[PDB]
Scaffold this active site. Structure first.
Site, short mmCIF file in Angstrom:
data_model
loop_
_atom_site.label_atom_id
_atom_site.label_comp_id
_atom_site.label_asym_id
_atom_site.label_seq_id
_atom_site.Cartn_x
_atom_site.Cartn_y
_atom_site.Cartn_z
CG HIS A 42 87.69 -9.21 90.21
ND1 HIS A 42 88.99 -8.84 90.52
CD2 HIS A 42 87.74 -10.54 89.94
CE1 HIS A 42 89.78 -9.89 90.44
NE2 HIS A 42 89.05 -10.94 90.09
CG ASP A 88 89.57 -5.77 91.85
OD1 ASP A 88 88.46 -6.09 92.32
OD2 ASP A 88 90.31 -6.57 91.23
CB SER A 185 91.83 -13.07 91.14
OG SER A 185 92.47 -12.97 89.88
N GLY A 186 92.34 -11.84 94.17
CA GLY A 186 91.79 -11.57 95.48
C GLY A 186 92.79 -11.94 96.55
N1 4PP Z 1 99.01 -12.42 85.54
C1 4PP Z 1 98.32 -11.98 86.57
N2 4PP Z 1 98.91 -11.22 87.47
C2 4PP Z 1 96.84 -12.37 86.74
C3 4PP Z 1 96.30 -12.53 88.04
C4 4PP Z 1 94.94 -12.90 88.20
C5 4PP Z 1 94.12 -13.12 87.06
C6 4PP Z 1 94.66 -12.96 85.75
C7 4PP Z 1 93.78 -13.18 84.51
C8 4PP Z 1 94.31 -13.90 83.40
C9 4PP Z 1 93.50 -14.11 82.24
C10 4PP Z 1 92.17 -13.62 82.20
C11 4PP Z 1 91.63 -12.90 83.30
C12 4PP Z 1 90.18 -12.38 83.23
C13 4PP Z 1 90.09 -10.90 83.67
C14 4PP Z 1 89.06 -10.18 82.79
C15 4PP Z 1 89.14 -8.66 83.00
N3 4PP Z 1 90.32 -8.10 82.26
C16 4PP Z 1 90.59 -6.67 82.61
C17 4PP Z 1 91.68 -6.01 81.99
C18 4PP Z 1 91.96 -4.66 82.29
N4 4PP Z 1 91.15 -3.96 83.22
C19 4PP Z 1 90.06 -4.60 83.85
C20 4PP Z 1 89.77 -5.95 83.55
C21 4PP Z 1 89.28 -13.30 84.10
O1 4PP Z 1 88.85 -12.91 85.18
O2 4PP Z 1 88.97 -14.55 83.68
C22 4PP Z 1 92.44 -12.68 84.47
C23 4PP Z 1 96.03 -12.58 85.60
#
Ligand code: 4PP
Ligand code: CA
Ligand code: CA
Lengths: 235, 91
Positions: A42, A88, A185-186
């Site tokens: 992603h 992912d 993330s990642g």
């Molecule tokens: N606490 C953590 N471990 C964590 C870690 C990394 C990122 C996030 C996070 C926090 C807020 C919003 C988003 C969003 C993600 C949008 C997709 N949401 C989903 C939910 C369920 N399945 C697939 C996708 C963003 O990328 O801005 C991601 C939380």
């Protein structure tokens, strides 16, 4: 990273950082070798052009000791699902070989069967990154790390408002104000055995950050160890 | 008399010493009275491997992540190159 602490020098050396066109870090990664970087699929869709910065430990001040590498090739899991975030995982083959040094070293990839019994069964793991220091806050100045307890699938799933596939696992706290967050993330999720750190997860997503009742969700790397080696035996 | 009780097990040999007996264990037994197994599978202490462990015919076989070579003793992992994986960095 919400909670946790800043990594000491040479403490989280397998931490890479994907920077966008504005050299703004937007995702983390895990140095697998001098040429490959493990990341989330992603993250491949959050920047028109990105590079990989390693050795970096403070995004604001250019202490040096770091380097930016251009991605020669990107190998995403052909099964990545944008809606559920299943599959992912990704691997980026760098154009130039990383020169390992203080703060730039790889994390070991474990053997599948052994990981599931000796690592995944452990009490905790370590996730790091330059993500946000709070759900609302901003990205940290320096690289941070956090020890997150492994959570059982059942508890994980009963807490999620989204499906938890087997290519996923939970890690973190129910109500304790600590977890990963956007920007992390990642990034790496590492588990230590006899003082050697083995790649065990990729920061995938979560419902907010450190939110009571919820945990952080990672990509069960064990399900992709064979996939990774495959990807890692390329051009 | 120390050996009158024959404190040794698994066909070990009791040998009264100065003021205490002694057990000369058979092959694969250890401990004061040869009451322990020297052979342990991956389940116990990871079979003594530094990294990966696995059994092959009821016998432990260790292995290491790339960038490492298994010690001649068959347990330890030795980093071949300068910055082996999984290790934090010094200097
Ligand atoms: N606490 C953590 N471990 C964590 C870690 C990394 C990122 C996030 C996070 C926090 C807020 C919003 C988003 C969003 C993600 C949008 C997709 N949401 C989903 C939910 C369920 N399945 C697939 C996708 C963003 O990328 O801005 C991601 C939380
Ligand atoms: Ca810097
Ligand atoms: Ca005596």
């Amino acid at each position: 990273i919400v909670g946790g602490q800043e990594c000491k020098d040479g403490e989280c050396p397998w931490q890479a950082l994907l920077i966008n066109e504005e050299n703004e870090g937007f995702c983390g990664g895990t140095i697998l070798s001098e040429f490959y970087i493990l990341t989330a699929a992603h993250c491949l869709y959050q920047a028109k052009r990105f590079k990989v910065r390693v050795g970096d430990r403070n995004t604001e001040q250019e202490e040096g000791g770091e380097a930016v590498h251009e991605v020669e090739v990107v190998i995403k899991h052909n099964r990545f699902t944008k809606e559920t975030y299943d599959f992912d995982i990704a691997v980026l083959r760098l154009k130039t070989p990383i020169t390992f040094r203080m703060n730039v070293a790889p994390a070991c990839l474990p053997e599948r069967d052994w990981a599931e019994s000796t690592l995944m069964t452990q009490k905790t793991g370590i996730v790091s990154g330059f993500g946000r220091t709070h759900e609302k806050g901003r990205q940290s100045t320096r690289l941070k790390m956090l020890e997150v307890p492994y959570v059982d699938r059942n508890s994980c799933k009963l807490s999620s408002s989204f499906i938890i596939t087997q290519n996923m696992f939970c890690a973190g706290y129910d109500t304790k104000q600590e977890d990963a967050c956007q920007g992390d993330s990642g990034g790496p999720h590492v588990t230590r055995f006899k003082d050697t750190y083995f790649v065990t997860g990729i920061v995938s997503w979560g419902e907010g950050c450190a939110r009571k009742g919820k945990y952080g969700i990672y990509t069960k790397v064990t399900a992709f160890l064979k996939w990774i080696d495959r990807s890692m035996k390329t051009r | 008399d120390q050996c009158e009780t024959s404190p040794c097990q698994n066909q070990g040999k009791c040998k009264d010493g100065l003021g205490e007996y002694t057990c000369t264990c058979l092959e694969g037994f250890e401990g004061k009275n040869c009451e322990l197994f020297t052979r342990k599978l991956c389940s116990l202490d990871n079979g003594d491997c530094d990294q990966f462990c696995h059994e092959e015919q009821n016998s432990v076989v260790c292995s290491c992540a790339r960038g490492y070579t298994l010690a001649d003793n068959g347990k330890a992992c030795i980093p071949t190159g300068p910055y082996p994986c999984g290790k934090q960095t010094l200097e």
